[PDB]
Point group: C2
Chain length 224, copies 2
Amino acid sequence: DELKQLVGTKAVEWIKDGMIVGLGTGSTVKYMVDALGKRVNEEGLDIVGVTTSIRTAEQAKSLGIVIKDIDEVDHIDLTIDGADEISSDFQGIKGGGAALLYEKIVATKSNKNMWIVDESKMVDDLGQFPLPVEVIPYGSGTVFKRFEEKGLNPEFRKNEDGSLLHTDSDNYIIDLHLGKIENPKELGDYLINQVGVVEHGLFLDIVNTVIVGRQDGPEVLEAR
Amino acid sequence: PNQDELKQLVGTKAVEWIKDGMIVGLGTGSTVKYMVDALGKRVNEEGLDIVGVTTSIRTAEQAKSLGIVIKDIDEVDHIDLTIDGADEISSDFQGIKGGGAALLYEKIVATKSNKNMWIVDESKMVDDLGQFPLPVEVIPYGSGTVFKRFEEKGLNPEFRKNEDGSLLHTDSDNYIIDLHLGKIENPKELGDYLINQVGVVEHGLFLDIVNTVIVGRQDGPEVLEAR
Ligand SMILES: [K+]
Ligand SMILES: [K+]
């Protein structure tokens, strides 16, 4: 929590008056949103937020931040979100919290993307964290069998009570337990070209800046 | 009229490919309607034994009303043959589908199927695809943004509406944007672009899929072996 809070506080230095800002999810982002509300309510910062989730929208609105729908703004200047893993090549896995689709829709509209993470999220190669894939329910068992045959070690995502998780768009999630993803661009191409795959959790050539929480403070890394 | 008679002709001709014990994918549309009627006849009046796998809620409603057994696609381990319609078939046997808004489940079923047969009246045969607007199935969240990207890309998009003017919802509860492209000279490139767009679930280009086409002509059905 200590690392998350220094990073969330540092991140809001990137926000400028007049901006439209995408706000992501996670414990790390929660600290950032609190520090953003601080600036809005003490320093007169004027901005509009777009969020990847309800929980964040409700937090931002309780702080007096104006939130609009994605299709109500003509651009997003900067989106600040967390990540489940970030590799040495600055490719990400996201959607551990099941919102990979809306996260990618917000990221794609955004001019810049910043990810804020503690040190434990930085890996050499992606793949220890299971890769989520959003799948149309009808035929999802057959998609699962294709993934099993390819060697991707698929598992359907469950709610705490063991029922199938349904996403915001009413799809299922299949997590792939891959171990190591040496070629994420090849895997992403395979996945998106499978019938019934709506989106996957590889966020490739997206993040521009990363802020990493280390024991000695936040470190800023430029990706692209 | 003449067009209904051609659709009737190919729908009746198509059911000859159906044999006892097959698992058959059932398409969607006004031509498929005749085929499902013909299949029902063979089931109820000839004791033909098969299992159907549907591509839309409409087709399942028709098949159930006829006593055709329908199984979920994930309850069958293979599909022998799928018989569906098409909005356009090009001279190299590529298709546009989705005029009936069922492109996604149509493509899911076709992909499981060992063989795919399309049944059409002669008006469906084109040299190049594209006069018929290309349907694209899109996630609702962010779909105005997607629409604007297509507009900027010069793709002439239009959201699919019901007859009352409200937005059409597909069986999976997505929207459809039809693209008024006029002529599509490189459909593989176009398919690749569309599927790579965030928020696009599936598109109506059905490339290197169809095996057999039955075309209803003025002098009868012509069977074309595509691949
Ligand atoms: K896909
Ligand atoms: K897509």
